[PDB]
Write a protein that binds this ligand. Structure first.
Ligand SMILES: O=C(O)c1ccc(Nc2ncc(Cl)c(Nc3ccc(F)cc3)n2)cc1Cl
Ligand SMILES: O=C(O)c1ccc(Nc2ncc(Cl)c(Nc3ccc(F)cc3)n2)cc1Cl
Ligand SMILES: [Cl-]
Ligand SMILES: [Cl-]
Lengths: 122, 122
């Protein structure tokens, strides 16, 4: 019977993205070939089956550096990292293939489904 | 513009609350009189002016224990901590005063405004 604040979840995500933009309390660097990206492990876990399966393991919990598969495109990863922190996906014809490839690797089923719905109406 | 995922923010907050429930990557303990509560500093900062003002300071960034004002009711605090992680506020006639007192201290303006609208509507 609790009071529902319908803007609170989007407000928290916006603030977490602002902390990321300021490098505040980011605890991991994601290396994607020649490019590197800082992030909060909790956010990565909250969005990705890959990152969830890594950091829930007490063996890997404390890793400060994650090297992604060499085949992953840094731009495709960055669009997905932006999606994690904003709820907005930069999808188009020019990147649909690399974006879907990365979302499949990161195990982000809703992005994969949306990529499959983008193809179906292309 | 970019594709909007209207459930993504809520999905991220639910997953952060599940991580809290499993004590995964919690990095602070909030001491409230005889009681203690573990949490993610990022989430506390994202929801509270108090915690944002403490942890944005490089001097205080790495604190692992925050002792709140002795007057703060642990129950009012727990209701607000649950709100931070769920977007749902447990307000009643029996706790409005302690929850409002706590939200003023924690600098959570939207909760303070809702507490002011609860009083105005009996
Ligand atoms: O769909 C299910 O059956 C299912 C239900 C609940 C659940 N719990 C959970 N708790 C905390 C986090 Cl941080 C999290 N992250 C996450 C995991 C896998 C992903 F592909 C994406 C994100 N998931 C996990 C699963 Cl796999
Ligand atoms: O009041 C304003 O005009 C204002 C506008 C934007 C802003 N930016 C911000 N970026 C990151 C985080 Cl984690 C955050 N947390 C937070 C801060 C103060 C609060 F009472 C609650 C939450 N706020 C801070 C303020 Cl103070
Ligand atoms: Cl997804
Ligand atoms: Cl608030």
């Amino acid at each position: 019977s609790q009071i529902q604040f319908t803007r609170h979840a989007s407000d928290v995500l916006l603030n977490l993205n602002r902390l990321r933009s300021r490098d505040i309390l980011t605890d991991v660097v994601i290396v994607v070939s020649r490019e590197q990206f800082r992030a909060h492990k909790t956010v990565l876990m909250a969005c990705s089956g890959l990152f969830y399966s890594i950091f829930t393991d007490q063996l890997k919990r404390n890793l400060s550096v994650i090297n992604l598969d060499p085949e992953i495109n840094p731009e495709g990863f960055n669009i997905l990292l932006d999606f994690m922190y904003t709820s907005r996906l930069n999808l188009r014809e020019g990147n649909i293939m690399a974006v879907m490839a990365t979302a499949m690797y990161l195990q982000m089923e809703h992005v994969v489904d949306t990529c499959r719905k983008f193809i179906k109406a292309s």
